[PDB]
Amino acid sequence: SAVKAARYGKDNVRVYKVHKDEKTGVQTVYEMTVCVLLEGEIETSYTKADNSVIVATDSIKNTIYITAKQNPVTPPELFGSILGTHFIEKYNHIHAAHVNIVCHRWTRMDIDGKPHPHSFIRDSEEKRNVQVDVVEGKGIDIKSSLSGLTVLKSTNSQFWGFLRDEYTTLKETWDRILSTDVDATWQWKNFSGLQEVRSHVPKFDATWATAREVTLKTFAEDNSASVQATMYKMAEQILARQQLIETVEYSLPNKHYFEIDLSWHKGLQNTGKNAEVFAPQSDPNGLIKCTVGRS
Amino acid sequence: SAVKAARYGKDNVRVYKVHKDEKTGVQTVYEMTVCVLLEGEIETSYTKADNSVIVATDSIKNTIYITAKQNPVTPPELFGSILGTHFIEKYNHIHAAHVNIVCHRWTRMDIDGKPHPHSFIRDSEEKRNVQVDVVEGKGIDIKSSLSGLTVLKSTNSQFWGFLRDEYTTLKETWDRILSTDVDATWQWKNFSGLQEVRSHVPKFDATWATAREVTLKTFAEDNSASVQATMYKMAEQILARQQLIETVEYSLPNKHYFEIDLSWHKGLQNTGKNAEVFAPQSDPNGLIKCTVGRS
Amino acid sequence: SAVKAARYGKDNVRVYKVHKDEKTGVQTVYEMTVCVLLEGEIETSYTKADNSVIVATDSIKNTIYITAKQNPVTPPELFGSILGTHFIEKYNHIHAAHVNIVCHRWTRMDIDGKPHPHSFIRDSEEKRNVQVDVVEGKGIDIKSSLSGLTVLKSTNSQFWGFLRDEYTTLKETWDRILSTDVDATWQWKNFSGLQEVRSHVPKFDATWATAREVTLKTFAEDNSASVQATMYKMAEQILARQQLIETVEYSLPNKHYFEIDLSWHKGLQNTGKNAEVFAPQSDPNGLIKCTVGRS
Amino acid sequence: SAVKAARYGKDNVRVYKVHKDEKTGVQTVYEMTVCVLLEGEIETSYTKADNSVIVATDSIKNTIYITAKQNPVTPPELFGSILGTHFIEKYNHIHAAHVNIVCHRWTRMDIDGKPHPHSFIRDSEEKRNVQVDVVEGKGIDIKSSLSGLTVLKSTNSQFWGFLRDEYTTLKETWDRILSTDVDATWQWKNFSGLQEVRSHVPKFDATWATAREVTLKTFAEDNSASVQATMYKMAEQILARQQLIETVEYSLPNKHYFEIDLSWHKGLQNTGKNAEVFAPQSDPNGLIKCTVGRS
Ligand SMILES: O=c1[nH]c(=O)c2nn[nH]c2[nH]1
Ligand SMILES: O=c1[nH]c(=O)c2nn[nH]c2[nH]1
Ligand SMILES: O=c1[nH]c(=O)c2nn[nH]c2[nH]1
Ligand SMILES: O=c1[nH]c(=O)c2nn[nH]c2[nH]1
Ligand code: NA
Ligand code: NA
Ligand code: NA
Ligand code: NA
């Protein structure tokens, strides 16, 4: 037998950092969960019990905190690139670092109409994520994403004209509820190294904001023919607005809300045009994916 | 042996209801999870296999949907009272109904500065809850709550002056992070029945809004001496603002964020006044509770 | 306003302890999650910011580890009683301690037919729990439980003869699936203090074993008329087998598995006597409770 | 823009099936959660709102139940292959089906020493999984796995001899706790189609059993130099025992249990040779992966 692939590191490293403005007294907090996995010339730790090649996962943990102390943690695309580059430069036998960061929301509180200097609220479990792969001699590949953005529209979704055969019971509809948890990922063109990532720093937050805005507006305004058709419209717009993105991927569950026929009870009318009360279904769910790139 | 207590019913009943304004085209959605448990002269279903006394839990499920079809589902204090009253009036041998409702957030989307007529976002897993106990001949007891409101302040929390003995290692501090998930419950004076609940309908939403506002403002503005001291200030204010509340209960975890000493690495300074990077602790956590009533 | 009730302490304290037999080389591990909440003359920490009355929750955490170091951690009824008694005896102004322990399974591995000396498997998320309330001058109240015991029987469950009215759609049945997650609690007679708890130590493990065995055998062998009727049979037997128990409480969800009518597809027969494929329902679920005591 | 990749289908489809032996009265249950995602000539549903190419996800759901009715659901490698083949053969424009099955444990109860005919227990959340990719003209690729197998050994794990530099604080050790949740995947050689999968049916259960046995025995008996070294020993043995496997992949968290220094309290000794009470750490955790193949 032979080792075909190997990677190891530290997962679930929670990190908080505060920035304090001395002039204004305003504080800003960042909280993330970080995973770092390394690859390189480490096969002998597996095959020969040779620990000499292992940067201990505990040391990887220390490195994450030290790196956060000495560098900006925002945008996460930059922090992840700094962190991955550290490992491939510091250790001769480590040739790739894979950094995943999940950013948690701490949104500044408004008290009596004004922004509070040091108090924050978690408004939703929506996350902003990055996956950064730093590979020696092959540059830096960054995939940015938002996830856990849960939305619902109560009308202006349709689904008709699909294939009907002996396995089909679903009725065509011209008016249904559409609800989903949005997972959207935009993949950046390869960067040559950290200097190039630094050169594009302002584009990261702006592109996240664009992706989020296009997602919400398209969802709200599209008279949706299907999840497929609506998601493609989102992806097309993001690609149009940022030239440095190569592909956009969406993964959307279709979280079903079923009509409840109550006609058995005193002829009560609660279907079609009369539908007011619905039963949200926890499972199963549709799952629709697409990756959109450039012609 | 004898049956000392018994209750049974349906849990985890998900319900969605849409309201459609014909004039304006505006739609408003409500989504809840409902539990209804009944008590009464039902001992023989347990002791003698006498199912004749059982209102099937499936029928309880049907009743929840029918009731939501025929009645307002907001405020949840009212809906829960209607639902509980139904069971004690309809069935001679059922003498108490216990209704728990969890309300999920569907907040209207703002697109391009304006409120969208039929699109919604789940902004946070914060819930608004009610527990309604409808007991034949003893009226209606309602406990209203908010839960899952997660907040953090990065300074203006202290903790010193506590008992020190041979079990104590904690250092006194004049500046720490304070973060919690707020669970707050206000208990209404007993209502004589549904007519009385109806008479107070406007107070329910207003008191929820007050409770939330007092919680956020007090948390943000108090230079906190302890979780104990800050929570008492919250409770005192809520009681002052609504005469029909008898008690307020808070249950607050203290979600610890630890300093990280980095001095072992190149004398890096990251403690006390120099603390910038912290380690959020998943467990253990402080848990602090208090029930405040009137003198 | 006044403080009507208050308790505070440390939750989610994970503890592991190993016992090593020097003669045999056999090791035995215990893992628990512990919560300790204190009550007493502590109102002024809430009302006056007087921290002098607060045993810091961090110190409570230290005390749990020290107590586990110096005492047996099994049976958990004993450990919880030692731990609660410590707080009321050590601190003059603390008058009640409430200790909750969840015990996690680490079952010795069998390798090649023999028990391994130091390797363990988590066979299921079933837990054994205790709640111990130690109240100065009122002794020690212990509630022991098992929870998360998930079972299913594929036949020999019936449900017919229930109330039918205009809210009823459920069909009577003489053969259904019954599946539940068992939560069973037995409440001990009050103990005068630690000496009395010590005197009954062997009864704790034996009664847990009895409760578990009676639950499984009754579930498997009863031709169940309802969840109500089967659960009562369990409780009756436990009370008969241990005189020192005052009450037994069961809380059982009815986890529904629905028939799937496939007759629309080529007349396929999959209902009643022909039912082979079913759809497990995640929600809603029946919830049935009863507390059984002595005549 | 262009569609670069697309797949869609139904996730989280819960399925239960019972087999009833008429001669013996013995019943056997199977419960699974199934996901099926399709690919093919479906781009126009995304780009042109052309639903004519869409096999509705609801129909995919129906197909799963019908297929379970008409075919064995065990071993899951076979069921997944039947299910995936159905879609590529039935629909001309569908060219790949991706089937994921999670099998849940329902283990026959032993009552009074004998196996019960129709009662089952969920002994642990360990799962047996398959991923089956059926691709038109390219055969059937099957990855089988076990996951959620949680184990701990209290001694006979070491970790010393790792790289030490200015980022390192971890002390070398010759005796520690090792605990993990095992995720192990074996990838079968490509099969030409369903006839070939059928020809190997007995190997599926036998190889799962082997993988599980080798995992448990190696974990228990290895005097572990590292997670890396122990996991490689597992993989090597599985490959040796089944020629039709091409690669074995393990992904193992290192779930840390920390010593607790209690020496500050009355000189209490609880470290090194005196360590009895430990603090399980929920996070962070090491994560160690390797894929082993044939020379
Ligand atoms: O078994 C281990 N492998 C590792 O790579 C490691 N790093 N810290 N502790 C460790 N233990
Ligand atoms: O065992 C049952 N008990 C009940 O109360 C019930 N209600 N619906 N189905 C039921 N099954
Ligand atoms: O606010 C606090 N209250 C407490 O009771 C406590 N105990 N440790 N830290 C604490 N912080
Ligand atoms: O938007 C949808 N897309 C689909 O593929 C589908 N299948 N069933 N319902 C559906 N809705
Ligand atoms: Na390198
Ligand atoms: Na009544
Ligand atoms: Na005392
Ligand atoms: Na095909």
Structural domains of chain D, ranges and CATH numbers in brackets:
1-295 (3.10.270.10)
Q: Could you give phi then psi for residue D76, rounded to 5 degrees? A: -65, -25
HSE-up of A12 (CA within 13 Å, CB side)? Answer: 13
User: Which of these, D216, D209, D236, D109, lies nearest to C112 by C-alpha position?
Assistant: D216
Structure-derived torsion over alpha carbons of residues C226, C232, C235, C237, reported in degrees to the nearest 10? -100
Task: Give me the DSSP letters along D102-126.
Answer: EEEP-EEEEETTEEEEEEEE---S-
Are C124 and D120 a contacting pair at CB < 8 A?
A: no
User: Which of these, B65, C170, D65, lies nearest to A259 by C-alpha position?
Assistant: B65
Chain A positions touching B31 (Cβ under 8 A) are: 280
3-state secondary structure of D64: helix
DSSP category for residue C155: S
Residue with tokens 């996460």: A76
**Paired tokens of D98:** 């991706």
Question: Is the beta carbon of D54 within 6 A of some atom in ligand 4?
Answer: yes
Substitution site in D176, D179, D254 for ligand 1 pocket (most atoms within 8 Å of beta carbon): D254
Q: Which residues pair with A96 in a beta bridge?
A: A39, A135
Q: Which residues pair with D258 in a beta bridge?
A: D279
Strand (E) or helix (H) holding A3 = strand A2-20
**CA–CA dist C110, D181 (Å, integer):** 18
Method: X-ray
Q: What residues of D are designated binding site?
A: 57-58, 159, 176, 227-228, 254
Do the strands B257-259 and B277-280 form a parallel or antiparallel pair, or are they unpaired? antiparallel
DSSP category for residue D53: G
Q: In the annotation, is B256 catalytic?
A: yes
DSSP category for residue D272: G
Tell whether omega for the bond before C72 is within 30 degrees of 0, i.e. cis: no
Is the CB of residue C123 less than 8 Å from the CB of residue C107? yes
Q: Which residues pair with C259 in a beta bridge?
A: C278
Is the CB of residue C146 less than 8 Å from the CB of residue C128? yes
Q: Could you give phi then psi for residue C209, rounded to 5 degrees? A: -60, -40
**CA–CA dist B255, B235 (Å, integer):** 21
Q: Which residues contact B12 (CB under 8 A, 6 or more apart)?
A: B33, B35, C283, C284, C285
**Paired tokens of B50:** 């006498």
User: Which of these, B42, B134, B41, lies nearest to B87 by C-alpha position?
Assistant: B134
Q: Which residues pair with C253 in a beta bridge?
A: C287
First and final CA of chain D: distance in angstroms? 43
Are C226 and B57 a contacting pair at CB < 8 A?
A: no
Residue with tokens 């890396």: D228
**Paired tokens of D147:** 């996951």
Do the strands D245-254 and D285-293 form a parallel or antiparallel pair, or are they unpaired? antiparallel
3-state secondary structure of D156: coil
Would the annotation count A47 as a binding residue?
Answer: no
Tell whether omega for the bond before A280 is within 30 degrees of 0, i.e. cis: no
**CA–CA dist A117, B153 (Å, integer):** 9
Question: Is the beta carbon of C54 within 6 A of some atom in ligand 3?
Answer: yes
B44 inside 8 A of chain C by CB: no
Task: Give me the DSSP letters along A277-293.
Answer: EEEE--S-EEEEEEEEE
**CA–CA dist D197, D190 (Å, integer):** 10
> How many angstroms separate the CA of residue B145 from the nearest CA in chain D?
30
Interface test with C, best of D152, D259, D274 (most C CBs within 10 A): D152
Question: Is the beta carbon of C56 within 6 A of some atom in ligand 3?
Answer: yes
Is the CB of residue D205 less than 8 Å from the CB of residue D255? no
Do the strands C27-40 and C2-20 form a parallel or antiparallel pair, or are they unpaired? antiparallel
Where do runs of H (alpha helix) occur along chain A? 43-47, 57-70, 76-90, 194-199, 201-221, 227-241
Q: Could you give phi then psi for residue B288, rounded to 5 degrees? A: -125, 130
**Paired tokens of A230:** 């609506």
Tell whether omega for the bond before C202 is within 30 degrees of 0, i.e. cis: no
> How many angstroms separate the CA of residue D20 from the nearest CA in chain C?
9
Q: Could you give phi then psi for residue C9, rounded to 5 degrees? A: 170, -150
Residue with tokens 């809840």: B32
Burial of A111 (0-12, 13-18, 19+ CB in 10 A): middle
B284 alpha carbon, distance to own chain's centre: 23
Task: Give me the DSSP letters along C209-235.
Answer: HHHHHHHHHHHHH--BS-HHHHHHHHH
3-state secondary structure of D265: coil
| Amino acid found at D116 | H
Where do runs of H (alpha helix) occur along chain D? 43-47, 57-70, 76-90, 194-199, 201-221, 227-241
Residue C61's CB is within 10 A of a number of other CB atoms, namely 23
Identify which ligand lies nearest to the alpha carbon of B41: 6
First and final CA of chain B: distance in angstroms? 43
Please give the radius of gyration of chain D, using alpha carbons only, rounded to the nearest integer. 24
Is the CB of residue B201 less than 8 Å from the CB of residue B244? no
Is the CB of residue D57 less than 8 Å from the CB of residue D10? yes
**CA–CA dist B16, A8 (Å, integer):** 45
**CA–CA dist B164, B171 (Å, integer):** 10
**CA–CA dist A206, A208 (Å, integer):** 6
Strand (E) or helix (H) holding D33 = strand D27-40
Chain A positions touching C264 (Cβ under 8 A) are: 169
**What angle, rounded to 10 degrees, do the helices at C57-70 and C76-90 form?**
130
| Amino acid found at B60 | I
Handedness of CA A106, A112, A114, A119 (dihedral sign): negative
Are C286 and B8 a contacting pair at CB < 8 A?
A: yes
Substitution site in A171, A223, A226, A232 for ligand 4 pocket (most atoms within 8 Å of beta carbon): A226
**CA–CA dist D64, D70 (Å, integer):** 10
Task: Give me the DSSP letters along C17-85.
Answer: EEEE-TTT--EEEEEEEEEEEEEES-HHHHHS--GGG-B-HHHHHHHHHHHHHHS---SHHHHHHHHHH
3-state secondary structure of D101: strand
C156 inside 8 A of chain B by CB: no
DSSP category for residue A262: -
Residues with their C more than 2.5 Å from the N of the next written residue in chain D, i.e. before a break, are: none
Please give the radius of gyration of chain B, using alpha carbons only, rounded to the nearest integer. 24
Tell whether omega for the bond before C75 is within 30 degrees of 0, i.e. cis: yes
Is the CB of residue C186 less than 8 Å from the CB of residue C247? yes
CA distances to A230, B244, D11 from A282, in Å:
23, 38, 11
CA distances to B97, B138, C94, C163, C170 from B93, in Å:
12, 16, 45, 12, 21
Is the CB of residue A96 less than 8 Å from the CB of residue A43? no
B287 closest CB neighbour out of C11, C55, C63: C11
User: What residues of D act catalytically?
Assistant: 10, 57, 256
Residues 45-64 of C with CB under 8 A from D: 62
Q: Could you give phi then psi for residue C251, rounded to 5 degrees? A: -135, 115
Are C51 and B160 a contacting pair at CB < 8 A?
A: yes
Q: Indicate the resolution in Å.
A: 1.6
Interface test with D, best of B165, B170, B264 (most D CBs within 10 A): B264
Q: Could you give phi then psi for residue C25, rounded to 5 degrees? A: 80, 0
Q: Which residues contact D158 (CB under 8 A, 6 or more apart)?
A: D173, D174, D175, D176, D223, D224, D225, D226
User: Which of these, B264, B257, B145, B279, lies nearest to B212 by C-alpha position?
Assistant: B145
Do the strands A94-104 and A107-111 form a parallel or antiparallel pair, or are they unpaired? unpaired
Q: Which residues pair with C20 in a beta bridge?
A: C27
Are A264 and C167 a contacting pair at CB < 8 A?
A: no
Where do runs of H (alpha helix) occur along B180-256? 194-199, 201-221, 227-241
**Paired tokens of B73:** 């589902």
Q: How far is the CA of D71 from the centre of ligand 8 (A)?
A: 21
User: Which of these, B102, B4, B3, B7, lies nearest to B55 by C-alpha position?
Assistant: B7
HSE-up of D55 (CA within 13 Å, CB side)? Answer: 28
A-contacting chains (≥3 CB pairs under 8 Å): B, C, D
B48 to chain C: nearest residue by CA? C229
Is the CB of residue A257 less than 8 Å from the CB of residue A277? no
Question: Is the beta carbon of A226 within 6 A of some atom in ligand 4?
Answer: yes
Question: Which is the closest atom of ligand 2 to the Cα of C226?
Answer: 1
For B8-69, what is the HEC assignment? EEEEEEEEEEEEECCCCCCEEEEEEEEEEEEEECCHHHHHCCCHHHCECHHHHHHHHHHHHH
Contacts 24+ apart (CB under 8 A), D42-47: D42/A228, D42/D6, D42/D8, D42/D93, D42/D94, D43/D3, D43/D6, D45/A226, D45/A228, D45/A229, D46/A228, D46/A229, D46/A231, D46/A232, D46/A290, D46/D3, D46/D6, D47/A232, D47/D3
For C96-153, what is the HEC assignment? EEEEEEEEECCEEEEECCEEEEEEEECCCCCEEEEEEEEECCCEEEEEEEEEEEEEEE
Q: Which residues contact A31 (CB under 8 A, 6 or more apart)?
A: A14, A15, A16, A17, A103, A104, A106, B280
Strand (E) or helix (H) holding B83 = helix B76-90
For A84-104, b/e burial (b = at least 16 CB within 10 A) is bbbbbeebeebbbbbbbbbbb
Are C56 and B291 a contacting pair at CB < 8 A?
A: no
Chain C positions touching D111 (Cβ under 8 A) are: 216-217, 220-221
Burial of C202 (0-12, 13-18, 19+ CB in 10 A): exposed
**CA–CA dist B216, A119 (Å, integer):** 9
**CA–CA dist C124, C146 (Å, integer):** 12
**CA–CA dist B231, D278 (Å, integer):** 34
B222 inside 8 A of chain A by CB: no
Substitution site in A156, A159, A255 for ligand 4 pocket (most atoms within 8 Å of beta carbon): A159
Is the CB of residue B66 less than 8 Å from the CB of residue A260? no
User: Which of these, C10, C20, C133, lies nearest to C64 by C-alpha position?
Assistant: C10
